[PDB]
């Protein structure tokens, strides 16, 4: 079929098919005003705080935000109108209802209205797509350090000496698989790494500064 | 045999067997004055700068420093005198010369003189031994970062946007085997890691401060 | 050929072939007086301290002691005379000399004289054979213990608490391959193990006591 | 959600949400009086023997003791108040009831009261956490020994001789997986190991003695 | 080339090329009188005891016996004359000498004389070939049995009871690879196996008896 | 719980709990008269042929015979009284009925009466336990032999010759897993193996004879 | 139990248990008249065409034919009467009905009547058993051939040349697993293989002819 | 370098460099008259039988025939003149002689003369190249068949029955690696395969017949 | 040592150590005039065509070009003077000569002169370094296509139909390992791929056009 439709989005598809023309047009306007990099939580909170929006939009907001992952899975080589028609067929086949012709056309028209524009969201999910062409990425880390004292073969001598060691442990996702990695350190190397990363941070700040003509974004 | 004698230390063993009584006693005194954690390079440089020492000591200094790795490979359960005798036999069997009885006894006596004392050096190599009961340890790392701009399907629109990414690569030894590991980062996580490691550094400083009654050393 | 002859035993075979009749007969007598479980070092030391024995016996003593490993590799189903003849052929083919007929017969006769009797030595090496039908056995072990103190998140509180841990490491041979194994313990389990092994030791002593009619040996 | 809530603790969560203010405050006091290293069985028995405590506390005692494993899974970087709120939400979502606002606030307040303090319990579970950063640990062992007699090829000779062997078998957990290991011994090595472990025990006693200023605990 | 010529048979090939016409004809006669199943040792001993045969035949007897393994490696589809010519070329190329034309023709003629006939030897090596189309075959075995007594937890009771066990170990060749296999038995199963193998032996004797019109051979 | 109670033994446990005092005492007497090595079938048949025994004993006879496998799974270090109490609790928790206090005490008392004594049965199952510390054991075997005739490339010659081969196939259990093994033989090796096993059988008979002071049993 | 009873044969077992004495005796006679190698389809068709036989026999004919696979799974070492009794017990335990004593005895008697004789069928399934002691066997094959023409780099030259190739593909069962194998051929090798297989066919015909005293069968 | 020059072709390259102009031109003519599919042996025999050709051509004939494998390893995209120059350089660098300029030019001119034309040979080696784009191909096979008789459990019955089986074994090269494959057959399947391959042979003959306008070749 | 010195560059190092001051200064000037992306062949050809340069420069030109791979293996964190000193030591230790002090200083000074500047070459090898942080890259490919005709089961019908197929094969290096990959295509997909790659080529041209302020290079 046209799309690998999740079975949970079917209610959102029904809401969008039955949604009012005013609501879809206003949502399209707001999406066209959406800045790049906005996340799902902020979008849904803004929808909630918008009084003119019924709960239908918020209940379908996740589906709307999910469009960015399929807005680029589709390509300019195809006609958005035919994409809307085929996806309406896919939803009527695998979704909640075999939509009647009038609501089928309403859903297709709403798809065309909303799937159009969608520029900043599509670019955001492209940045995310360009982001993870790689193999792996961090998620978190934890630092652990221990100290241990030095003893004698015969304890007729009191313990005067010890040793301090350091450990780091990190977490990351590789090829859609979560992972972690464990290492032990000494303070001097930690300081050296701090110097390296501080130098790279200054580089990054200078890069912020270099192209005042262009914007550079953090995407989460 | 008593020891897995390196074939390069044979000249050092010959020098020690023929070494003067004054030189061995003075070297034993200096070693008994050696602070814990002193490395081979510093010891050899100090030997060189000491005028009373002939080149024999410096040429055997590496062997002297190598004793710490076998000073603990031996154990208090054995008699140092018999250890010296057996190692003299091992050297006379696998080493340069089948030592004559007089020089055999001279070598054994010199071993007893110098292998005795050797407290701080033995404790240093114990710290190194207690150090690497683990599996792996760092050696170095390198930070790499890249930036990339965002484009349009049709370049009727000028490029206004881009994305900045960061990469770290690290090197380490595991189970006597050198290794490396590669990861990509974002600035926020780098800052968070900096905060973590700075907190741990403050912890380490407070640990420096906590036990004024005991010393804690960095060993290299 | 008859035996997988070591190339170092060839000198011992030559000595035995040329050895005096008095010496071989006396050695056969002494071997027939040998108690079970005697090791090579004790046998060679006794040979050295025996004045009537020339250095030929001591230089061939290791070969004599090596017979126990091949005294059972052979079996009663074969004639010791033909075994001696075939092994003389094997030595003359792979060994030092193509023995002349007179010394060939002398060697065969000496083999028959000495390979005969050899009761306690053969039984000792059978015990060793019955010993290692298994897979693995110990060789040594080492006990290691460490202690570590408990700290606070904020060191406004002084450290009042710590923890003590124990470690054991062991060495063993499996299937002719040396091995080791590492574990960490607590004092209570160490005490419990001490109780178990003490109970088993009392069992072993009672077993010493139970069969006064039979002897039980430790073989090394 | 906030926590990987076990589905059996839901009743304990309900009890805690509906629990009396006097009971939660008294339990918080008792927990603040709890010494480090106390185990679940002793805590529950003490709760049972305490007359002022209803069966609600004992039925939720296991959940209370389970907090130590999640008291450190959380970290000081987060606000305990928000932790309580989020975990109340998690319980109301995955647990028994969609708690009403009044009992929701009661549960959050009770969490704040009891999750606070909890110093010795948290330190105990930290010691357990610091305990098992390793790979494996014992659980038990069993000692087995056998004896076997020596025979002749022809039994015209009566059996006068035998051999005694010893076996040890041990059990341990590695990486959350139970394991065992099997070895055979001789009495001499058993005695040698006894000597080693006794020496280490004397070391441990001297370590007990060395730091009178600090306490060291056994945790089970 | 025609054959994977062993480099040790080259002397035998030279002897055969230079061998007398009378000797080759007599050897061909004797081989045509050879019964099936005769082994190399018996053939060589008979050659030695035959006075009319020079040492040339015995020194080439092993090569003659080796022909059976290549007498069937060749096939009736090829002309024995051309086989002799090609193998003479192979020997002159890889062997001792680039044979002169006269001795080349002599060798080819001798090959034709002797490689002809060779009926019983060829059939014997065919039986050996038909023998080892399988995967594996025995070579030897050894039987081992042990007995062990039953003890009490407290030896206030004297040992009245024991247990007897049996072991068998076997050796075999599989796919040109030597192998062994180990098992433990009880007396009853040994008796049952004895009964089975005795029944099969009676079957084999009846099979000896059944076809008086045909002969059946043991080949070694 | 105390025991991994089979769910089929629950009826036997109920019968034993409700069983008469006379019956349990008589069964304990009979078990104390039981010789070592008696199997379940013989015990149950004897119970059936005993007129004073009701069907309760036979229906619980299998459970009684199953005690030997758990009579040694328990150990002398534990109190049989507490073992009976804990197993009564285990049965009342996982078994047919939450036994009333009077029948609970009756069951515990019956367990103490019958679980006591049980000397020969416990020793029998110990022999079985000492039996299978190994890896594998036989269960059966089958002997197969075939004969095949020798033919010619051209059948102008009548077939005069053939070959006889032998095969053995065996079955065994390894590590609680059934197994089999297949081999082909020749008559001579079969005869040799017969000689070996007959020699070992004579050894076993001489071992029967050697210790008239002790008994040795076959256990099935 | 006695047999791994298929759950579909239970109806056949019921029919046989209730079958008339005349029918079972007549079927036993017919089976004793059955020639070796008869397949299930022919046997069932003959049963159908036999007017004296009710549909009971045909409905149980498959079970009757299935006996050959278990007629040899049993062995002469066991009593056919006890085999019938035990299999009647197995059917009454795992089959349709807990047979009443009268019909149980009827079934056992019918088994004894019919399981007896059964000579040619048993020998047929033995031939099938002797057949598949091997690893694999054919099931089918398919021949495929293709031809391709030769072209020029520049087609200013007309194509005058081509190449013809051949392919064979085959199917077989190995170790109860179906398999296939694919190869490409040339006409000359196909002709050579035809010659080989024709020669072997002539060999097989001569083998048909050689032993007029014995019969040789094709079994399917 | 230009070509992976074999070190044995160096003499052929020298001969070609020093070869006469008449000889190279005549050889080029003959090669231009060579039909497609001619093999090395036939070409060399024709060269030998040609009186006008010196032994130089035959000694370089193998190199000439080897050109087809490198005549297509080169491609029309390159200039044959520059190919000749570069290969002359390669031969002068890795070959016998650092050719003088005059003989260097002679060799290049001879290469251009002979490497030109070479149409049928190049097409032949292209057919061979187009041949082995696949993975594997036959080399030979062998057919083996056996027969075995059927016996009784008790030989009171004479053997009346037997079974005949068939075996095929084949050899092939895969990915430049020689291989073989073993299977057992029955006469019926052999006949069926004969029918299949005969049908395919008739297909191949009809394919011979179909395109009278084109030729199709067998290449060896 | 400082560098993993190739043993072939030793002559280049000697030449550079003995090289004239004028030559090294002129070469440094020329290198500072070198544009980015220049390859070794062009650099060496330019050196050859430069009359003022002796053959010393060309013979050391490859070493000079090899500096880019080690100019970045070193880093700005180190002093180029000390790098030159350490590499002079490395060459004097592992290279041709233990350089005399005067020529040692000359070599160090020449290294400082030439290793300095080197901007475009270093950036070129950085681009190559930034190039192959990936895993693999192409080297070549080859396109192959075939056509095949459609036939009938019975050739009473003439062949009117066929099928055309296409194949592509490609070569690439992965992780310093050469590789290839094989696929079959149809004309339509080839056309579609042509359209895709043409669109991407237009994109690349527009990218050429977009940043007139910056240069973008092809590096080989």
Author numbering:
A (entry chain D), B (entry chain C), C (entry chain E), D (entry chain F), E (entry chain G), F (entry chain H), ...: 1 to 220
From the paper:
The ten eukaryotic COMMD proteins are core components of the Commander complex, with central roles in endosomal membrane trafficking and signalling. We find that while CCDC22, CCDC93, DENND10, VPS26C and VPS35L are restricted to the eukaryotic lineage, ancestral COMMD proteins are present in both Bacteria and Archaea. These prokaryotic COMMD-like proteins have very low sequence identity (<20%) to any eukaryotic COMMD family members but share a conserved and highly similar fold including both HN and COMM domains. Our biophysical studies, crystal and cryo-EM structures confirm COMMD-like proteins readily form homooligomeric rings composed of eight or ten subunits assembled from core dimeric building blocks and inter-dimer interactions that are analogous to the heterodecameric core structure of the eukaryotic Commander complex.
As an example, MBK5214510 shows evidence for the presence of dimeric, tetrameric, hexameric, octameric and decameric species. In parallel to the crystallographic studies, we also determined the structure of MBK5214510 by cryo-EM and single particle analysis (**[Fig fig4]; [Fig figs6]; [Table tbls2]**). Within the 2D classes there were clear examples of top views of both octameric and decameric ring structures. Filtering of these two different classes allowed us to resolve the octameric and decameric structures at ∼4.2 Å and ∼4.8 Å resolution respectively (**[Fig fig4]; [Fig figs6]**). The octameric particles resembled the octameric ring we observed in the crystal structure, while the decameric particles were assembled in the same way as the octameric rings, but were composed of five identical homodimers rather than four. The decamer determined by cryo-EM is more divergent from the predicted decamer, with a significantly larger central pore, and is also wider than the cryo-EM structure of the human COMMD1-10 heterodecameric complex (**[Fig figs7]-[Fig figs8]**). (**B)** and **(C)** Cryo-EM structures of MBK5214510 octamers and decamers. These different oligomeric species are present in the same purified sample, indicating a degree of structural plasticity in the stoichiometry of the ring-shaped assemblies. In both cases a star shaped structure is observed with C-terminal COMM domains forming a central platform and the HN domains lying peripherally on each side. AlphaFold2 predictions were able to produce confident models of closed ring structures using either 8 or 10 monomers (predictions using more or fewer subunits produce either fragments of rings (e.g A0A558G9V7) or physically unreasonable structures) (**[Fig figs1]-[Fig figs3]**). The modelling, biophysical data (**[Fig fig3]; Fig. S4**) and cryo-EM data (**[Fig fig4]**) thus supports the idea that the bacterial COMMD-like proteins have a capacity to form closed ring structures with some plasticity as to the number of dimeric building blocks that are incorporated.
